[PDB]
Design a protein around this ligand. Structure first.
Ligand SMILES: C[C@@H]1Cc2c(Cl)cc(C(=O)N[C@@H](Cc3ccccc3)C(=O)O)c(O)c2C(=O)O1
Ligand SMILES: C[C@@H]1Cc2c(Cl)cc(C(=O)N[C@@H](Cc3ccccc3)C(=O)O)c(O)c2C(=O)O1
Ligand SMILES: C[C@@H]1Cc2c(Cl)cc(C(=O)N[C@@H](Cc3ccccc3)C(=O)O)c(O)c2C(=O)O1
Ligand SMILES: C[C@@H]1Cc2c(Cl)cc(C(=O)N[C@@H](Cc3ccccc3)C(=O)O)c(O)c2C(=O)O1
Ligand SMILES: [Zn+2]
Ligand SMILES: [Zn+2]
Ligand SMILES: [Zn+2]
Ligand SMILES: [Zn+2]
Ligand SMILES: [Zn+2]
Ligand SMILES: [Zn+2]
Lengths: 399, 399, 399, 142
């Protein structure tokens, strides 16, 4: 057991900063919250619940050589890099993440759960599900020789073109040990393809995916830049929409009526626009899309917040450098979202998005994921960049 | 010809113990039953019809090395073990069995019918039919290298994901010489998978399987632990439900309305719970499921019997050691089922489940499958563990 | 322990019938022989060591449908037939055999050694080694479609065409669990090919096979009908020559100088010639060879015995019906070989051919393989057809 | 990226068919049929040219030295543990090819005959050496 003494306590359920409190931690869970057994003295720090990043890619990090290192590097090298990526993420203050694509992440989650390596609690989607020529198609851009040798991808590889193939793909992801399902409803900006906002799924295919995923207890996250694919995904019944660059009034109304969550990923847009002044960074097929679609997310997210769409915290890390996830708070506040709502989007709304109930608040019976900051973010949001204390499941990783 | 003199005769059609009788056997069939030509003197023994076990796996027997001996052993070694397994089963008093999975069993049935080896009369299902990642998926748990080399299984291997694939799978089982069809409606407890009670078939797929099987004269047996898969299988029209650990009131009502048979398999649950005090026996993926789902069958079976669900005899042997099938009678009686009903569930109800009419009773025109016991099971059910006489199709195998 | 009381004892080391003796058996070995503890009374029987058949095929038995049942039957059916074949062989009086081809036999040997099934002690060669189009080529006679699908066989299948391929084939047989090596030096009479006495191995290939086999402790047996292939195999240094239909003076001189053993297989020749009066029994490609080469073995074997070539006992059973191996004694005696030498060729000489030292004689420290006959074979060789007692490794199988 | 010692890696071991380092030892015939018979790219050699190709394949994959299994082992799924599994010519070919690329050869050997063959062919070190006798000791000293 251990008694943690917070100087100030942030109530995520309400959104207010309370006074001094003492946390009682035993068996990895919070047992008591008394206002005013080892002692951890944090009377000088603001004492917060652990953050959750709902959009990360722990198996990669963008670089000038990213597109070339897909035919030379093996998954073991990616696994060796993911160790440092995960340690940096956990030390930045994020005790839980949702991985939205990649085959190394389930193995990293299993290794972290066994105590082999240090990192956050990972909810992994595994392989993304796409159509032929879609944003997540694994053989996009290959020359005809390589495509001929490797064959046309199918449901086992995540590429579907009918209802039965979608059902088989969801079952294949369940077989491989996934926690949720990720689909690419439209085209993207970083893939080796032409379109970036065209509808790539039919409504029937998305409905089949959602219906199959509901049987296995999964939730579905949909990547969407264009309006028609976003509308189709929202009407089919997905749980969250990522990016959503070209959201309009009708999509906003449908999302409000359906209770869909929106994850904007400010950081990815800002990073890809800043990496445009640099002359050689992107292939000639990707650079126009990256110049066009980026940095239009900020206005869309501000409009969505003003219109009443529920917003949750996500960064799309793996485009940006791991361990720098907290600058998304500063980006969110700069766009007009209040600091308290920005902090709630990472604790209580993130738990709602994940579909769990044992995390997000410092209440009895919940997991003991506690962090502390030197300053107060409610007045200066830059205080999120200095984390002094990190605890996860009752184990202290940074003191 | 031969005249068998039973001291006491058990009437399976009614469930009562009659007085002395003389059986007249010729050409493998019973011709005459007279109350009060070679002579077989069994005046000291209770004279019964041969038993039928509706759930066996003659091609395997569980052991501490069971999971490893799937990449080292060939089917010929399994065939060499099945000879002793079948002889033990026949000597235990069971003249007929229903094999519910395995590729060696049809060959063993053909060999026994030709007189090459000794054993009971086998009704074989062959390969089980499942979905991707299902309980009967042959490549569950393999590393990605082996899965890549062997390819994704399809209907010829028994893995289906649509209506047409299910039709093709039923036709493939018919082509390979099967007598019935077996599907896994939910997950299991002994497979290398995560879920154990999730719905793995849609209603349309099960209906397609049942409709195709009806054309070829087949019956469908469904493995089911969870409630939703059990409900789907019952509504689609299967003939019997195996295990049924999480049966509730609605499933019971549907089964009573549809006339579905229930096979609980007490022995498998008792054996898997007893093999839990032993420290190392099961893989870490299987042991929680085996600790959770086992020994909950006894209360479910007792409740089903009290509610009026038709119950038939089955053991799931191959988990337990072959030749010990008769302890299921003692388990059945311990749970509250009367001894006479327990004996009827193996003779006349088993014949109804199989869909035959020439066995189960000692009536003229029926097969001459007669056994004898030293004691009386109606007062002491432990008398089923001492079989003195075994006859099958007019041939005496134990005297 | 057990004390066996033989009425008359045959001394294999000398070849004489001694007087009454008492055998002392414990731990599966003979411990004491005393002229003149349970008691086995065999005072009325001649007490002999167990016989060894150096040429059997326990995985097959020739029939009118033999050539068709290579595309319809699976190895499991052959395994189910081999159980009865092995029991018949053991009951005929043969406690040890050398299997000279077939993939089921190593598995049968493993099953017998574990006590699963009853049979003799098997020394198995596994897959035969041949060249392209050779007598043991597994795809001889297939239409071009099947040959195209299955591909051209290589060293892993037993087909070699160079020194390195022969080395790899010997290593592959060692990997699969073989006890010796079998090659086909010439063509055959029962295969689906044209030639029956042409040289199919070069001297270098046979020398490579012998040199590789010597490293792993193996002995080499060579199938040979024609003179040139027989000469090449003898000069390369094989241990035994089978059939040897067209042996001449030079081959006899080379065999005498090299110490090569000769196994004639009277029974196979007599069978394939008796099955010639029957109109339809053999394919039109095989029947001329079977009519020509058969029954010429008797004169060749008689000439070889007169010339001083060492002769050992073998039948080529699997062409003839299993369990009838002892008629080879009558065939041997009919050709002029003395009865005592015929009995020695199956006991003390067979052990020399196998390369073992713990069997063949009833001496202390040897295995307890004892059989008994009603009559005396030294005066009437027909007494070998009535075996009354069978013991193997101290276990009585027939009394 | 991670902490550890300085590693000199041999990569895939080089063996013969059924050898101690054979990657498909003990597999049932179905798995062996699907995966195919291993060759030089997998590290299984049966001639001089195959040994040369195997050494070149290890060089291509980024190895620092070469490891061969001269005899059988004790922890593999095989029968023999001290039988000679390489011929002298094959080991000489391996050593000669490895000398061109600056590699050294380490030989696994329990039995006496395989140990003698590896020592005479010119390997750098002998591992285990359970059944070493006087003649092998003299050859090693020389
Ligand atoms: C392994 C991981 C897989 C992956 C997947 Cl499945 C999707 C994305 C992705 O949605 N990228 C975005 C990047 C982006 C850029 C700007 C604004 C929003 C998003 C895109 O190209 O549209 C993505 O960026 C990545 C990625 O970084 O690599
Ligand atoms: C070859 C044969 C195939 C087979 C199949 Cl298809 C199904 C089962 C099976 O239903 N096992 C059950 C074992 C079990 C355990 C407890 C209570 C009920 C059943 C399960 O794991 O859910 C099963 O046990 C077996 C088996 O034993 O191996
Ligand atoms: C499975 C087993 C494999 C086998 C092999 Cl590998 C070889 C022979 C064989 O040598 N048969 C002889 C039969 C024979 C007939 C007459 C005189 C001598 C031999 C032949 O055809 O020349 C042979 O007969 C058999 C056989 O019977 O089937
Ligand atoms: C991945 C790695 C590969 C490997 C290889 Cl290539 C060889 C050995 C090895 O030589 N093992 C020895 C173990 C041993 C045991 C006792 C005395 C000497 C050696 C053997 O089985 O003969 C060996 O042990 C291992 C091993 O441990 O796994
Ligand atoms: Zn995206
Ligand atoms: Zn993404
Ligand atoms: Zn089951
Ligand atoms: Zn079962
Ligand atoms: Zn032959
Ligand atoms: Zn033969």
């Amino acid at each position: 057991p251990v008694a943690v003494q917070c100087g100030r306590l942030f109530d995520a359920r309400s959104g207010q900063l309370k006074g001094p409190h003492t946390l009682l931690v035993a068996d990895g869970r919070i047992r008591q919250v008394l206002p005013g057994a080892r002692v951890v003295d944090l009377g000088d720090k603001v004492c917060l619940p652990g953050w959750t990043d709902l959009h990360v890619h722990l198996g990669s990090q963008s670089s000038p050589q990213s597109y070339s290192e897909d035919f030379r590097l093996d998954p073991v090298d990616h696994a060796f890099r993911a160790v440092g990526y995960a340690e940096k993420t956990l030390m930045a203050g994020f005790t839980s993440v949702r991985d939205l694509g990649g085959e190394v992440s389930p193995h990293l989650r299993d290794a972290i759960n066994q105590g082999l390596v240090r990192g956050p609690r990972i909810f992994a989607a595994g392989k993304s599900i796409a159509t032929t020529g879609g944003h997540a198609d694994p053989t996009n851009g290959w020359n005809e020789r390589l495509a001929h040798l490797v064959g046309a991808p199918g449901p086992a590889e995540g590429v579907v073109n009918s209802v039965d193939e979608a059902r088989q793909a969801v079952r294949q992801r369940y077989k491989e040990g996934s926690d949720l399902i990720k689909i690419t409803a439209t085209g993207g900006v970083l893939s080796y393809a032409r379109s970036g906002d065209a509808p790539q799924f039919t409504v029937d295919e998305i409905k089949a995916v959602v219906d199959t995923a509901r049987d296995y207890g999964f939730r579905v996250a949909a990547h969407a830049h264009g309006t028609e694919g976003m509308k189709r995904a929202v009407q089919a019944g997905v749980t969250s929409i990522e990016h959503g660059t070209y959201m309009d009034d009708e999509v906003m109304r449908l999302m409000k009526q359906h209770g869909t969550w929106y994850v904007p990923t400010f950081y990815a847009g800002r990073f890809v626009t800043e990496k445009a002044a640099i002359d050689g960074y992107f292939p000639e097929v990707v650079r126009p899309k990256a110049a066009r679609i980026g940095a239009l997310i900020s206005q869309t997210a501000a409009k969505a917040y003003r219109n009443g769409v529920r917003i949750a915290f996500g960064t799309n890390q793996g485009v940006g450098p791991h361990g720098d996830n907290a600058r998304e708070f500063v980006y969110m506040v700069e766009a007009g979202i209040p600091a308290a709502y920005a902090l709630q989007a990472a604790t209580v709304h993130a738990a709602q998005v994940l579909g769990v109930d044992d995390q997000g608040v410092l209440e009895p019976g919940k997991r003991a994921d506690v962090i502390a900051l030197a300053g107060n973010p409610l007045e200066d949001i830059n205080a999120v960049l200095d984390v002094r204390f990190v605890m996860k499941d009752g184990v202290i990783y940074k003191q």
